[PDB]
């Protein structure tokens, strides 16, 4: 679950996650939140587990 | 029945937001702003609307570029950079 | 006073004509070159009702004399004209009902 730029689309989000985190995106879901911000639901392939990546970033 | 019962039948907005001013004055079917005259090239303003023009005149906004022009005049409209005097 | 009802008709705001279902401009064929010296044979495809008038209209089909084309005409049907008839349009066309002379 990521907070993404309002100007982004799902192609940029998929590419950006790959560059920053060296992980593969399976799908992207976007919703503009009621506070005028974009939230992204980034699902990794079964090759990767988000549990070991979320704490790699530093939030868990 | 022209009072309270008729007031329950107003649910279709005659105006929406205006791109150029934003005052909820873009008449939808006429496609013309009621307040700022949009989408005319000029801006609607009148010598009988003295109060109205005072509301939407130069200075009532951020003045994003015209503020600095006055001191730029004082410096002779100079160019370059200061040389560590 | 106030302007009167026969005065308000010229603004053409609500006093226009109702033309959603009207078939088309029921005109004659053009006088290009093939009628002023000869004729051209045509076929009646269908005779249909016209909203607004009480006279039926005919769909008369001709072959284009200058392109591989099947230009179709909207005539006012003569009483006696039937679907499948042959229509002759020219100067030397016979004196028969349905012909354009």
């Amino acid at each position: 679950v990521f907070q993404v730029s309002m100007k982004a689309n799902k192609y940029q989000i998929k590419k950006a996650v790959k560059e920053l985190y060296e992980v593969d995106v399976l799908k992207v879901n976007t919703l503009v939140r009621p506070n005028g911000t974009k939230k992204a639901y980034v699902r990794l392939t079964a090759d990767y587990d988000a549990l070991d990546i979320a704490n790699r970033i530093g939030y868990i | 029945g022209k009072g309270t019962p008729s007031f329950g039948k107003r649910h279709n907005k005659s105006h929406t937001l205006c791109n150029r001013c934003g005052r909820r004055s873009f008449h939808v079917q006429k496609k013309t702003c009621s307040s700022c005259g949009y989408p005319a090239a000029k801006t609607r303003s009148y010598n009988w609307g003295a109060k109205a023009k005072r509301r939407h005149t130069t200075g009532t906004g951020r003045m994003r570029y015209l503020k600095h022009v006055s001191r730029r005049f004082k410096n002779g409209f100079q160019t370059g950079s200061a040389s560590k005097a | 006073g106030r302007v009167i009802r026969n005065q308000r008709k010229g603004a053409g705001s609500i006093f226009t004509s109702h033309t959603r279902l009207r078939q088309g401009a029921a005109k004659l064929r053009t006088l290009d070159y093939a009628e002023r010296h000869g004729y051209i044979r045509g076929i009646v495809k269908q005779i249909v009702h016209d909203s607004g008038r009480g006279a039926p209209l005919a769909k008369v089909v001709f072959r284009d004399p200058y392109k591989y084309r099947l230009r179709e005409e909207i005539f006012i049907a003569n009483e006696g004209v039937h679907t499948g008839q042959f229509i002759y349009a020219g100067k030397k066309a016979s004196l028969n009902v349905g012909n354009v002379l």
């Binding site: 503009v32 009621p34 005028g36 911000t37 | 937001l17 909820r24 | -």
Partner: protein, 50 residues
């Protein structure tokens, strides 16, 4: 309405951010006079007309 344009939902987000009381520490400022939020708006009292 449920189906809405981005202008409307964007301008509602602006009005949702602005809907909360005064920050507490501002009244502790030197030479402060603002005692509360005079532009607070609630959905039941006055309408936004957007």
């Amino acid at each position: 309405a449920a189906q809405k344009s981005f202008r409307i939902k964007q301008k509602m987000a602006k009005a949702k951010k602005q809907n909360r009381p005064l920050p507490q520490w501002i009244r502790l400022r030197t030479n402060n006079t603002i005692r509360y939020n005079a532009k607070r708006r609630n959905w039941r009292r006055t309408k936004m007309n957007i």
